Structures are given as C-alpha cells and as structure tokens.
Design an enzyme around this catalytic site. Structure first.
Site, PDB file in Angstrom:
ATOM      1  N   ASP A 122      -8.665   1.544   1.852  1.00 18.41           N
ATOM      2  CA  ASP A 122      -7.896   0.334   1.536  1.00 18.41           C
ATOM      3  C   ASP A 122      -8.752  -0.948   1.557  1.00 18.41           C
ATOM      4  O   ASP A 122      -8.430  -1.902   2.269  1.00 18.41           O
ATOM      5  CB  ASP A 122      -6.640   0.219   2.437  1.00 18.41           C
ATOM      6  N   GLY A 163       1.886   4.964   0.796  1.00 21.35           N
ATOM      7  CA  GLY A 163       1.793   5.817   1.975  1.00 21.35           C
ATOM      8  C   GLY A 163       1.536   5.074   3.270  1.00 21.35           C
ATOM      9  O   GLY A 163       1.170   5.698   4.271  1.00 21.35           O
ATOM     10  N   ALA A 164       1.724   3.740   3.260  1.00 23.19           N
ATOM     11  CA  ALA A 164       1.546   2.894   4.436  1.00 23.19           C
ATOM     12  C   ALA A 164       2.827   2.891   5.266  1.00 23.19           C
ATOM     13  O   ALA A 164       3.926   3.020   4.719  1.00 23.19           O
ATOM     14  CB  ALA A 164       1.186   1.480   4.020  1.00 23.19           C
ATOM     15  N   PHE A 165       2.673   2.758   6.586  1.00 25.12           N
ATOM     16  CA  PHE A 165       3.764   2.768   7.556  1.00 25.12           C
ATOM     17  C   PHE A 165       3.458   1.773   8.660  1.00 25.12           C
ATOM     18  O   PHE A 165       2.296   1.395   8.841  1.00 25.12           O
ATOM     19  CB  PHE A 165       3.926   4.182   8.152  1.00 25.12           C
ATOM     20  N   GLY A 166       4.488   1.406   9.415  1.00 24.37           N
ATOM     21  CA  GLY A 166       4.370   0.478  10.528  1.00 24.37           C
ATOM     22  C   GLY A 166       4.426  -0.979  10.119  1.00 24.37           C
ATOM     23  O   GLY A 166       4.795  -1.303   8.986  1.00 24.37           O
ATOM     24  N   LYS A 167       4.072  -1.870  11.057  1.00 24.20           N
ATOM     25  CA  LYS A 167       4.086  -3.315  10.846  1.00 24.20           C
ATOM     26  C   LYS A 167       2.936  -4.007  11.582  1.00 24.20           C
ATOM     27  O   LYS A 167       2.538  -3.576  12.669  1.00 24.20           O
ATOM     28  CB  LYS A 167       5.445  -3.906  11.251  1.00 24.20           C
ATOM     29  N   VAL A 168       2.406  -5.085  10.970  1.00 21.88           N
ATOM     30  CA  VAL A 168       1.300  -5.892  11.499  1.00 21.88           C
ATOM     31  C   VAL A 168       1.867  -7.107  12.212  1.00 21.88           C
ATOM     32  O   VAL A 168       2.545  -7.933  11.601  1.00 21.88           O
ATOM     33  CB  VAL A 168       0.269  -6.288  10.406  1.00 21.88           C
ATOM     34  N   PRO A 225       0.813  -1.233   0.000  1.00 20.70           N
ATOM     35  CA  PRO A 225       0.000   0.000   0.000  1.00 20.70           C
ATOM     36  C   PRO A 225       0.840   1.274   0.000  1.00 20.70           C
ATOM     37  O   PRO A 225       1.826   1.374   0.733  1.00 20.70           O
ATOM     38  CB  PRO A 225      -0.868  -0.117   1.263  1.00 20.70           C
TER      39      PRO A 225
HETATM   40  C1  6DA Z   1      -3.629  -3.658  10.421  1.00 20.09           C
HETATM   41  C2  6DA Z   1      -4.123  -3.948  11.678  1.00 20.09           C
HETATM   42  C3  6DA Z   1      -4.773  -5.150  11.914  1.00 20.09           C
HETATM   43  C4  6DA Z   1      -4.959  -6.076  10.886  1.00 20.09           C
HETATM   44  C5  6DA Z   1      -5.652  -7.367  11.130  1.00 20.09           C
HETATM   45  C6  6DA Z   1      -5.309  -8.477  10.412  1.00 20.09           C
HETATM   46  C7  6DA Z   1      -6.016  -9.696  10.576  1.00 20.09           C
HETATM   47  C8  6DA Z   1      -7.050  -9.770  11.548  1.00 20.09           C
HETATM   48  C9  6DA Z   1      -7.279  -8.511  12.235  1.00 20.09           C
HETATM   49  N1  6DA Z   1      -6.644  -7.376  12.040  1.00 20.09           N
HETATM   50  N2  6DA Z   1      -7.774 -10.914  11.770  1.00 20.09           N
HETATM   51  C10 6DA Z   1      -7.435 -11.982  11.075  1.00 20.09           C
HETATM   52  C11 6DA Z   1      -6.461 -12.079  10.083  1.00 20.09           C
HETATM   53  N3  6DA Z   1      -5.967 -13.102   9.274  1.00 20.09           N
HETATM   54  C12 6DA Z   1      -5.013 -12.534   8.577  1.00 20.09           C
HETATM   55  N4  6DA Z   1      -4.824 -11.197   8.858  1.00 20.09           N
HETATM   56  C13 6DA Z   1      -3.816 -10.376   8.316  1.00 20.09           C
HETATM   57  C14 6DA Z   1      -2.517 -10.446   8.829  1.00 20.09           C
HETATM   58  C15 6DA Z   1      -1.524  -9.603   8.361  1.00 20.09           C
HETATM   59  C16 6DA Z   1      -1.837  -8.638   7.403  1.00 20.09           C
HETATM   60  N5  6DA Z   1      -0.938  -7.729   6.846  1.00 20.09           N
HETATM   61  C17 6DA Z   1      -1.554  -6.985   5.973  1.00 20.09           C
HETATM   62  N6  6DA Z   1      -0.987  -5.994   5.276  1.00 20.09           N
HETATM   63  C18 6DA Z   1       0.454  -5.844   5.110  1.00 20.09           C
HETATM   64  C19 6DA Z   1       0.834  -4.406   4.824  1.00 20.09           C
HETATM   65  N7  6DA Z   1       0.862  -3.558   6.023  1.00 20.09           N
HETATM   66  C20 6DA Z   1       1.970  -2.589   5.948  1.00 20.09           C
HETATM   67  C21 6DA Z   1       1.969  -1.689   7.166  1.00 20.09           C
HETATM   68  O1  6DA Z   1       0.721  -1.006   7.319  1.00 20.09           O
HETATM   69  C22 6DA Z   1      -0.349  -1.946   7.410  1.00 20.09           C
HETATM   70  C23 6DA Z   1      -0.410  -2.832   6.189  1.00 20.09           C
HETATM   71  S1  6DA Z   1      -3.267  -7.275   5.746  1.00 20.09           S
HETATM   72  C24 6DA Z   1      -3.155  -8.538   6.936  1.00 20.09           C
HETATM   73  C25 6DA Z   1      -4.153  -9.406   7.368  1.00 20.09           C
HETATM   74  C26 6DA Z   1      -5.734 -10.907   9.869  1.00 20.09           C
HETATM   75  C27 6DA Z   1      -4.461  -5.761   9.619  1.00 20.09           C
HETATM   76  C28 6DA Z   1      -3.797  -4.567   9.394  1.00 20.09           C
END
Ligand code: 6DA
Length: 312
Positions: free
Chosen positions: A176, A70-75, A68
C-alpha cells in the site's frame, strides 16, 4: 494475559496467537508493550482512563481519495494524557485480529519504517500503538501547499527507497505505497500502514484476494496471477506522479463515477506516461517511467533506484 505488561517481540506474538484462538464480560486490559509509551496508574495500564483516543481522518480536497481493498479497522490518534506524547493507533476487533497485523512491524525494524510500540486489548477492541510523524503525511503536504517541487520529491523518494530496500531485502511486500502512507519526521520520511503487508515464502507471491489501493496498483497485482516486491516500485512511481501533479495517475484522464473501471484501464494502458508532469527534469522523468515499467522483471529494484542520476 489478565493485565498489560512490558514484553518482548516473542511475548507480543504469543499474545496475538492466543487472541486468534466471549462478549458480555467486564472490559479488562491485557497485552504487551514493546515501548513504555503509556503512563501506568496503580501498577496498571488503563488506556480507557489514561489514553486520549480520537479518530484520525485526512481532509481530501482533490478525486484523490481511494478506499483500500481488503482493508479493515480504523486509524485513531492516541495520546498518553500524562506525558502528552502522540502516537498512531490502529483499532482492530477481536474476531478480525490475527498475528500478521503486528509480525512485520514488530520483527523488522528500520529508520524509514514506523515503530510498533505495543498491542493492548480492552474489551472487544485490540489497540496497536505505533510511531506517529509530527510533520503529517505527504498527502497532507500536497493538499495543503500543492504539487511538490522536484528537490522535495528527491528528499522523500531517497527516504522511501531506503525503507523499501529494507523490506524487500527481508522479502516483505508493503502492498500500500501511497502519499498518505508516507509520513514526515524532523530529519526523515517514514513508511506507515502495514495492514496489507505480506512476507514472501517463495519467489512469487500468489494472493487469495485483490488487496491495496486501485490507482497505485501495478498491472500484475490486478491480474492476481502472481507478483513480488516489484509491485511496491510501480506504486512508488504512481505516488511520484501524485507528488509532482497533485493527483494520482488515472483520475484526471478517466474521471470518477458510480460505475468505475480503473482495474481495466490500468491493465489495458499501463504505464501512465501521460500523467507524468510536463515540467519535470529528463532525469526525474527517466526515474518515474522505469519504476512504472509494465514488466516487473524489467522494473528496477529499490537498491537500483537509489543509485539513479536523478537522486544524486
Ligand atoms: C495505519 C496505522 C498508522 C498510520 C499512521 C498515520 C500517520 C502517522 C503514523 N502512522 N504519522 C503522521 C500522520 N499524519 C497523518 N497521518 C494519517 C492519519 C490517518 C490516516 N488514515 C489513513 N488511511 C485511511 C484508511 N484506513 C482504513 C483502515 O485500515 C487502515 C487504512 S492513511 C493516514 C495517515 C499520519 C496510518 C495507518
């Protein structure tokens, strides 16, 4: 301020504002929890010792993986070691942290939207604990069991539209909508990732930077000359194509290279009516092509789409 405590949305927002207003100091916990999701130890919430934090990465097997803009941080996948309760954790540094990263999820609560449990500052990182879907993402389901059946799409789309209708009624553009940002629960599908989300002040939103995932982007979002909540509807149409075909709208016809030009392709050829599945009902086809409508003023709202013949 000096320790983690339970608080209100008001307490949470006051903390976010203070952080946006010094490295080399002992890392102490501070922040507000909207939900009691972390087990306390000796009257403290020590996430560094009591919260299991592991990076949450999605295995992409189809080129259906777009970073994405302009996205920042980590999940991260956060888990309270004592109760074994699973949560999502958006890790943002102190310098990049601002009050918009929590405002939407903290103030606007709905069944089809992921709940914000709290914000915990430990050292140089701000930890945003959120609701996690025990059934994974729509993308994970697609990469696992292949393209979704029409009844499975109708079930997800009904839930997604309820969450969109809610956010659109509160003048909030999600920015998004993609299969990876739609997660499964035991009885519903919920919208996640509110990092690129904005609250509209006036009738037209004027972005300063180009933000979001390029393949799901509408022709008006690429232009940066102004857009609205209708942008999310085009993105839903693009996710609908991803759900029935297994690949997002432009990727198949225009392959991925070190020199991409997707923003130009979408602007010169949208809607992607060629990417719609050959084996889909006339009602479902009518639903997708209307959500992908080139003109946002002629594209339906989430409330209009819920009333469609295909969904009912
Ligand atoms: C931000 C905050 C919370 C979530 C989130 C993810 C979930 C979830 C609940 N919440 N429940 C179940 C589940 N099963 C898989 N996912 C999952 C795991 C990781 C993940 N990474 C993604 N994007 C990578 C890009 N980053 C770059 C930094 O800025 C944010 C976006 S979409 C994504 C989706 C998930 C997602 C984004």
């Amino acid at each position: 301020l000096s320790s983690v405590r339970y608080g209100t949305v008001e307490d949470l927002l006051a903390f976010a504002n203070h952080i946006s207003n010094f490295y080399g100091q002992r890392p102490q916990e501070s922040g507000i929890l909207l939900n009691m999701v972390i087990t306390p130890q000796n009257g403290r919430y020590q996430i560094d010792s009591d919260v299991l934090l592991i990076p949450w990465k999605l295995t992409y097997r189809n080129g259906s993986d777009f970073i994405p803009r302009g996205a920042f941080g980590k999940v991260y996948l956060a888990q309270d070691i004592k109760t074994k309760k699973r949560m999502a954790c958006k890790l943002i540094p102190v310098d990049q942290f601002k009050p918009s990263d929590v405002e939407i999820q903290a103030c606007f609560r709905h069944e089809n939207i992921a709940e914000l449990y709290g914000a915990v500052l430990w050292g140089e990182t701000v930890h945003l604990f959120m609701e996690a879907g025990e059934g994974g993402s729509v993308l994970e389901k697609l990469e696992s069991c292949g393209p979704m059946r029409e009844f499975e799409i109708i079930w997800v789309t009904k839930h997604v539209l309820k969450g969109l209708d809610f956010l659109h009624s509160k003048k909030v553009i999600h920015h998004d909508i993609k299969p990876s940002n739609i997660v499964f629960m035991s009885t519903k599908a919920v919208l996640v990732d509110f990092g690129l989300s904005v609250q509209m002040t006036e009738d037209v939103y004027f972005p300063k930077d180009l933000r979001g995932t390029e393949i799901y982007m509408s022709p008006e979002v690429i232009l940066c000359r102004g857009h609205s909540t209708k942008a999310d509807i085009y993105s839903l149409g693009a996710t609908l194509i991803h759900m029935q075909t297994g690949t997002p709208p432009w990727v198949k016809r225009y392959p991925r290279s070190a020199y991409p030009s997707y923003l130009y392709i979408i602007h010169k050829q949208a809607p992607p009516l060629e990417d719609i599945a050959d084996d889909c009902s006339p009602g479902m086809r009518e639903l997708i092509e209307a959500s992908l409508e080139r003109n946002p003023n002629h594209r339906p709202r989430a409330a209009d789409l819920l009333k469609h013949e295909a969904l009912n």
